[PDB]
Design a binder for this molecule. Structure first.
Ligand code: NA
Ligand SMILES: [Zn+2]
Ligand SMILES: [Zn+2]
Length: 374
């Protein structure tokens, strides 16, 4: 990734301007709900101006900073990808539920994560990547031992280092993990992304089993939603007290929020504090609040996560080995992803479901907007 100079910054601002103008189109009728691309790109522009200001008469130093170089390459690639999406999408961009339009939401989330990361690494415009404080102590010790004060690490190197303490036992597991951690979708892991991941999937001692059981195999997991989208989803279960879902929030990375239907006709949400999510969900099940994930009658049993020992390493190795298998047949490897639910399976099981007249996704019955080969 090349040195950042005045010309490159100029080209990025023009590319951002084009994306903003494409997204102002009244026919898209974007609601200002997060991630709101019409605020994010102006806000990213503004924070870059703050950086450039702090580095006035020091552009040669800023322009060589590795994080900054990688960020500006990604900003240019992501804006070009968004412009390309409109060009190829044509009138489908105006269909609220088209895949092109859902792809715009995905890019908008990425722009949101990129701005959060930039603000975290350049608070007030000054590079502070090398003094970034990782929240969880074990995760912080891991990063320092493997990487020192580095702000970003190529995925290939991050994987090899993490594997030494938390085995990544299969290629498919690695791809799923990368999609979870690499928020900015650029094949680098920053200290900021690592901080987020290790807060979400604490405790460190069972990191990857926590991730699998919360983000892969749990029907209550909604990934990034707004609170209005959570309420909209649970309102369908307003007459089933104990129905619950849990989500990430693009405006507050590193935290979970659990929405649930009460016994009195209300929907509330709780942000768990000083408690891993799985313990929050065990407690809430026992207490009668979190009974029916996404309104389903069956709730996962997370107590196997209760207690890096040698035993943890072996449990994670086994989970990672089984990860690649399609869980409908338990025979073929996963090789297709359903959109928009994101569930993975083999194409044999998808076909069999469809040939039997089965509707929507074989796991969750969500309508299939498209599929993507793995
Ligand atoms: Na990244
Ligand atoms: Zn299968
Ligand atoms: Zn599904």
């Amino acid at each position: 990734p090349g040195t950042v100079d005045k010309k490159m910054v100029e080209k990025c601002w023009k590319l951002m301007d084009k994306v903003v103008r494409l997204c102002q189109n009244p026919k898209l009728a974007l609601k200002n709900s997060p991630p709101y691309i019409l605020d994010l790109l102006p806000d990213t522009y503004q924070h870059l101006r703050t950086i450039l200001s702090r580095y006035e008469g020091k552009m040669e130093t800023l322009g060589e900073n590795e994080y900054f170089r990688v960020f500006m390459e990604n900003l240019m690639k992501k804006t070009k990808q968004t412009i390309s999406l409109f060009k190829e999408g044509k009138e489908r961009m105006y269909e609220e539920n088209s895949q092109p339009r859902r792809n715009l939401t995905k890019l908008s989330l990425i722009f949101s994560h990129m701005l959060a990361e930039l603000k975290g690494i350049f608070p007030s415009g000054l590079f502070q990547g090398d003094t970034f404080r990782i929240t969880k102590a074990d995760a912080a010790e891991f990063w320092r031992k493997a990487f020192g004060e580095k702000t970003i690490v190529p995925w290939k190197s991050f994987r090899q280092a993490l594997h030494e303490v938390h085995p990544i036992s299969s290629g498919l597991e690695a791809m799923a993990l990368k999609s979870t951690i690499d928020l900015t979708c650029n094949d680098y892991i920053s200290v900021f992304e690592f901080d987020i991941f290790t807060r979400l999937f604490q405790p460190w001692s069972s990191l990857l089993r926590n991730w699998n059981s919360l983000a892969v195999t749990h029907p209550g997991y909604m990934a990034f939603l707004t609170y209005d989208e959570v309420k909209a989803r649970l309102q369908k279960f307003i007459h089933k007290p104990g129905s619950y879902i849990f989500r990430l929030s693009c405006t507050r990375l590193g935290q979970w929020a659990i929405g649930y239907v009460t016994a009195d006709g209300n929907i509330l949400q709780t942000i768990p504090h000083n408690k891993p999510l799985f313990q929050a969900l065990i407690d809430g099940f026992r207490e009668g609040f979190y009974l029916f994930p996404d309104g389903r009658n069956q709730n996962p049993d997370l107590t196997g996560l209760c207690e890096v020992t040698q035993e943890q390493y072996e449990l994670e190795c086994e989970m990672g080995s089984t990860f690649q298998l399609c869980k409908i047949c338990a025979e073929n490897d996963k090789d297709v992803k359903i959109e928009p639910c994101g569930h993975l399976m083999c194409t044999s099981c998808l076909t069999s479901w469809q040939e039997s007249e089965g509707q929507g996704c074989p796991f969750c019955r969500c309508e299939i907007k498209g599929t993507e080969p793995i």
